């Protein structure tokens, strides 16, 4: 239930998230675009600096007034085919180099930590105060800097499928934000889009997002969601921890199958006032796919000895999730002390470096970094026994993959629905049906993906914001309005792209999208969006 104090806690979390996103954007621009910095920063350094900045900023807010506050989502930097879960520690850089020596260079940016021109860099971070969570995620583009222009600018706009994915994600984000804002004043919903006297539904959300994705020739990655957020329940680990109640719309391989054939989440709800909504949309480009196929996810392991595929990425996930329902008294004193530190963090995913007493840095020092690494060695020693007794689990690294439909149809599964992954460590992904109508299990689909020679990895663009549907008493302006805690025109400004694809205006859904854009621009009689501003540091 929205209140002045609850809204203020959400607002402060959103402000800290916006400031952190501006910080990472400035760091990346200085390292790769401005080039004032002598040595370019790497991805683990950027993640660590972002986390330290967030902790330093959050130290001053709600101190000695709130039991639990901290980082909700660790800083994740995903490049191209990687659709989530990439937050490596600083002590795994040489590990990554040694594990990926002799592989292809398709994941060279992730392996070396150094960004390259043409990269789609997706930055995700979240902040919670008293369990009230605000999460932001922005795709940006890395460009070569033109040496001839007096001012710094890209030589040319980004072109191709990555540009299509960025455009689709940005336009879907804006349209969904406007559509969810329309729930407060339902009469302003366009007639071509849906019923004037009726509200916003998950069916309308899904058909709008699918229409935008199909227009821009992109698929929706099966991790996308437009869901409701409560205290401590923000989907911070959605594929790992089951939830009692779910109110939102999700996209899966089952939904892709149903669209082709045209506590379980269902799109049979009505958006209500006084609610907080997370919108996380991942769009994968389908430019290189000459036929109709299915978009799925591939989990990255750290074992180089499982295959001979030179186009494989070998890495260890850096974010862990504590399972508070599991208890086991450990044998190592280091492991027991680490578990005591872990239980202080709460119910959000955490990095091993977040548990260091040296972290966050008061002054950025080489000695501070070295003491952090010295802590991290014993932290890994304790984490080995913690993970062995199922007290904590890894947050997976996932690569988007494309599997054609003809290979799936020609394949034979002798088990049907009965097959499942017995070696899987987590319950929720281990027993899953990605293709319920075809009777294909997750293990069977992974086997098909590995068996096909024409299964490729699709570039992904991501946009994720948090919004509040503020009622008239809740809002300052005496009218219902949408408060965007994260994202907007100041932090998530789109990069220079040029996409040949476009929305086709001769469709009712596209006309409703254009009218939603018009009514969002209309600041007099239309809808009211209040963006949350990043704060100044000096």
């Amino acid at each position: 239930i929205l209140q002045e104090s609850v809204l203020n806690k959400y607002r402060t979390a959103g402000q800290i998230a916006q400031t952190a996103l501006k910080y990472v954007t400035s760091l990346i621009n200085d390292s790769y675009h401005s080039k004032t910095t002598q040595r370019q920063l790497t991805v683990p350094e950027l993640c660590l600096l972002t986390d330290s900045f967030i902790l330093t900023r959050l130290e001053q807010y709600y101190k000695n007034k709130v039991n639990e506050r901290g980082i909700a989502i660790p800083t994740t930097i995903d490049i191209d085919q990687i659709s989530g879960g990439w937050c490596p520690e600083i002590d795994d850089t040489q590990n990554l180099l040694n594990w990926n020596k002799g592989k292809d260079s398709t994941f060279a940016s992730s392996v070396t930590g150094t960004l390259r021109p043409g990269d789609l860099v997706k930055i995700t971070l979240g902040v919670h105060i008293d369990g009230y969570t605000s999460e932001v995620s922005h795709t940006m583009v890395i460009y070569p800097v033109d040496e001839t222009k007096p001012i710094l600018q890209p030589t040319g706009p980004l072109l191709g499928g990555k540009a299509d994915a960025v455009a689709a994600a940005h336009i879907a984000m804006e349209t969904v934000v406007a559509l969810l804002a329309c729930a407060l004043t339902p009469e302003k919903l366009p007639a071509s889009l849906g019923g004037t006297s009726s509200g916003i539904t998950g069916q309308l959300i899904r058909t709008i997002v699918d229409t935008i994705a199909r227009s821009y020739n992109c698929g929706v990655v099966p991790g996308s969601r437009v869901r409701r957020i409560r205290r401590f329940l923000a989907g911070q680990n959605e594929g790992i921890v089951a939830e009692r109640e779910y109110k939102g719309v999700v996209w899966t391989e089952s939904h892709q199958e149903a669209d082709l054939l045209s506590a379980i989440p269902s799109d049979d709800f009505v958006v209500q006032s006084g609610e907080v909504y997370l919108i996380d949309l991942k769009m994968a480009s389908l430019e290189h796919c000459t036929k109709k196929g299915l978009v799925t996810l591939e989990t990255v392991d750290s074992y180089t000895g499982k295959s001979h595929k030179a186009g494989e990425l070998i890495a260890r996930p850096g974010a862990y999730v504590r399972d508070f329902a599991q208890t086991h008294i450990l044998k190592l004193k280091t492991s027991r002390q680490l578990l005591t530190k872990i239980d202080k963090q709460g119910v959000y995913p955490f990095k091993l470096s977040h548990l260091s007493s040296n972290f966050p840095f008061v002054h950025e020092n080489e000695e501070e970094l070295q003491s952090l690494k010295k802590d991290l060695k014993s932290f890994r020693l304790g984490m080995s026994e913690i993970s062995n007794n199922y007290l904590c689990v890894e947050s997976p690294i996932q690569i988007a993959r494309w599997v054609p439909w003809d290979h799936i149809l020609k394949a034979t599964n002798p088990n049907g629905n009965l097959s499942y992954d017995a070696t899987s460590t987590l319950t929720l992904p281990g027993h899953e049906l990605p293709l319920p109508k075809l009777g294909v299990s997750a293990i069977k689909l992974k086997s098909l993906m590995n068996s096909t020679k024409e299964s490729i990895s699709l570039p992904v663009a991501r946009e994720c914001n948090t919004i509040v549907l503020c009622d008239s008493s809740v809002s300052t302006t005496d009218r219902p309005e949408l408060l965007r805690l994260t994202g907007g025109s100041k932090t998530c400004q789109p990069s220079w792209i040029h996409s040949q694809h476009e929305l086709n205006p001769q469709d009712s859904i596209v006309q409703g999208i254009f009218q939603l854009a018009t009514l969002a621009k209309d600041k007099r009689f239309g809808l009211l969006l209040k963006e949350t501003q990043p704060m100044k540091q000096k």
């Binding site: 600018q153 054939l261 990069s495 040949q500 929305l503």
Partner: peptide
Amino acid sequence: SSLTLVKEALWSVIDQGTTLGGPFFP
């Protein structure tokens, strides 16, 4: 067979522009 009918239907169903941003680094 319902599975066979589903597979047959699947086989049947499978058988300017836009510009964002500008010449600047946000």
